[PDB]
Amino acid sequence: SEYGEKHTVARLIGQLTEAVRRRPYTVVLFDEIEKAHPDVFDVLLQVLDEGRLTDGHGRTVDFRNTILILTSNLGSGGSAEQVLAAVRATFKPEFINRLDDVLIFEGLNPEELVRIVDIQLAQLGKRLAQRRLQLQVSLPAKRWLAQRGFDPVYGARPLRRLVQQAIGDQLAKMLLAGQVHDGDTVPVNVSPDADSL
Amino acid sequence: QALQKYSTDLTARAREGKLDPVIGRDNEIRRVVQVLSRRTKNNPVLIGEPGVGKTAIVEGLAQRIVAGDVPESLRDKTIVALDLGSMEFEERLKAVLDDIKNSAGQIITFIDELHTIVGMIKPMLARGELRLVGATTLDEYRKHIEKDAALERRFQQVYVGEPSVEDTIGILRGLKDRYEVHHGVRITDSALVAAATLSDRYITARFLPDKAIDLVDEAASRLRMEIDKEEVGPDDIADVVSAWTGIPAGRLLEGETAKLLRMEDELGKRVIGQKAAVTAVSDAVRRSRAGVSDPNRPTGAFMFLGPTGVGKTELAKALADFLFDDERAMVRIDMSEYGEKHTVARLIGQLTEAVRRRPYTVVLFDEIEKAHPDVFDVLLQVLDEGRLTDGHGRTVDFRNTILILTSNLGSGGSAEQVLAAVRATFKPEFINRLDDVLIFEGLNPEELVRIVDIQLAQLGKRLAQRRLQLQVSLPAKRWLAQRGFDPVYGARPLRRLVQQAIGDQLAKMLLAGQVHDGDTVPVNVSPDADSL
Could you tell me which residues belong to the region C-terminal (chain A)? Predict the structure, then answer.
């Protein structure tokens, strides 16, 4: 996301090189490849389908058994081919050919959005392992958190702010003023609008 | 964290009550909350003529957020007002945008006066991440932003009207205490009504509430100068609105039943005779100030015609004299130029954007005969509805102006020779929409002496620089009447007779000696001409 100009090739040709030659098995990310100027793709072109590149010292580091992974956000809501034909704009066809199966993620279903709340509350339970502070969440609140998970433009990310606005605020106030100590159980209960304690 | 260094924080100032209370306008607040909470392209723009309150809406939104009357997914999202003056440059801007996007939409940015933003934010706007609220004037918008049509597709124009007195009286009662402390003077609430009432019919160039605060401020300053009467009052407000705009000269607070009681006789000091066509013009003003008028019609739309040289243009500049205290604040268009079918476009506009500023001016239409019968079609919904349109899509209301139409058709018809000639050019769907068609008569030599008195008083007031009084005897004063003759050309050849008799020999005797300042120059009847 930082390689907007044509001369940040040199920081990886290197930061990319001398992190593989030590242990040649690590998986490699590439986050938000849209913002790179189309010169970084030229460096990436012999990474694919050959596996080797060079540097100043003259060694050909072999990418023959790592799992490359590319992320993007192009289109972001194309019907069936609106998102696919937008890829053909920026990427030259000598780069789309060298890839494997281009995968499309879908959105999220409110049927498959309940269980994310289970994962998030299990995560917050494992965060409070220092205090041994178990917390009790009832099923009406556990489905109350799903219905504010809404508006499928922003994904499941506003749910992870919803949990910290509902539970975490009043818990963080009731944690450092008394009446909550180690080993206690803090149940949550559905007040007619918000979540009580 | 980088937004700490290149921004203010309106929410932090709102949380200690340091904002003036915003009263009114539920519709615009609900509209801003509606637009700001959609999925993509969620960034409104406030647009209106200046002074009507556009910063006040955003401060009211901040008050309503800190109070908490908003819906669920707008609660506790601070409004961080950005800058572009205080803000290597592209690195700094990318740091600001990265710091905004790093949050979870918890920040509402606020670029005030965003017409400077033209001189890399373009992909961020359309995706829907950074919420942006702005405020432009209506006429810097079409110069700086509408030139750059890739940007302006990503906004939502929220129009804001303007005017109103009833809330401004409350605003002025609220802010009364602050100026009494800085200038150590008391301010009386009797004057505080007048400083907003009287600042609407006179000062029609700026917009509202800020214009009605400068009067209180400058009146307090003048009173401090005089205290170098212990409080301000309704007189010094009038003193300020006289000394600025020179409005005091014309009229000087002339308005009340006592004026409108004497209007058939006050107007006679500049128009002589024509008595049956002043008792009708003097009636569409009295019935419109009593409250009997039809609330969807112009207050008077009447057409007077007749022969030439009668006083039909002098009348329509004399009833624009005590309403406005001047004689140049009227919409004087001349339809003697619209011979062809495509000069409609210069007024549809030159007619339009001279009313929408101050919607009270009297409108002339000189010599409507020469217009091709297509301009009458434009004029047809002016009458009996009061509104027309233009390119921008606004319906300007002519509901309380006094339309005036002049003509010269026939010019000497007996009783129906002049009236049936109107029926030739005008279609009957246009004669019906008018008020009482007035006919002027000619002039009588009995009522022609006093015009010479008016003309010589005018020439006396012209020589006020030289303090040069001139003495006119009664035999010469009736000698000028008898050359006023041949009732085809009206009283216009008399105003050449005066400049051929007096003005020639006076202009010769003025620049060669023997006439100086303060002297008296009498005229005396030589057996043919006028002597000195």
Answer: 108-197
